[PDB]
Amino acid sequence: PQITLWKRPFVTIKIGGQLKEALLDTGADDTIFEEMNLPGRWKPIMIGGIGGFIKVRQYDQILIEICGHKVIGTVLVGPTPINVIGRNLLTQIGCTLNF
Amino acid sequence: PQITLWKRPFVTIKIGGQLKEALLDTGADDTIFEEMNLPGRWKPIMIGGIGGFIKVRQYDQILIEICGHKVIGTVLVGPTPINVIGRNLLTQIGCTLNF
Ligand SMILES: CC(C)CN(C[C@@H](O)[C@H](Cc1ccccc1)NC(=O)O[C@H]1CO[C@H]2OCC[C@H]21)S(=O)(=O)c1ccc(N)cc1
């Protein structure tokens, strides 16, 4: 699909058997989700943003179904105010900016 | 142009007679720039992101030439780690996400 930007570009996603909405974020290097139940081991990391830094749990090789598109990549879980799909996964669905 | 997301989508922009690079950020509602010399009045406000909030100077009806496209809108100036072009201006150049 082609998505305009008059509203926040939210999409429906399936991850860890759970349904969630996430923001298509070209400004996000990596994908991050609010606190959620994901299986397996994880590594502590910290990411940086406009307001400073947050500590998040890094999960690798996580399956996401983005608007009916399956992708596998790194998914961070932590205190983000909003779920964000980062470029690490946007590339896998062939997402592009156009103007 | 069509922009893939294997690299940070930076574009060159001219604002207040100054040359700068800014990140096409679909996850950014509004445009914000690092500290810079901008003319006119401004209103103090605070915006929020990952890791928290920052206090920024809000300027309205500011002219930006984004990759050869002229636009006029609100531009925030403050301690962002990166210059970001927000949806408030992306819409005016007709920018869209595609996959
Ligand atoms: C610091 C920038 C590179 C912005 N980033 C993505 C961006 O889309 C965030 C994503 C975002 C969105 C909502 C809340 C927090 C973060 N938006 C943002 O901070 O912009 C602010 C200016 O416009 C306002 O609109 C809301 C946020 C404000 S980021 O959140 O910090 C980020 C950084 C690293 C990763 N791996 C993932 C995300």
From Swiss-Prot, chains A, B:
Coiled-coil region list: none
Peptidase A2 domain segment(s): 20-89
Source taxon at top rank: Viruses
Catalytic machinery residues: 25
Region entry Dimerization of protease, spans: 1-5, 49-55, 88-99
Assembly behavior: Homodimer, whose active site consists of two apposed aspartic acid residues.
Name used for this protein in its record: Protease
Portion of the full sequence shown: 501 to 599 of 1447
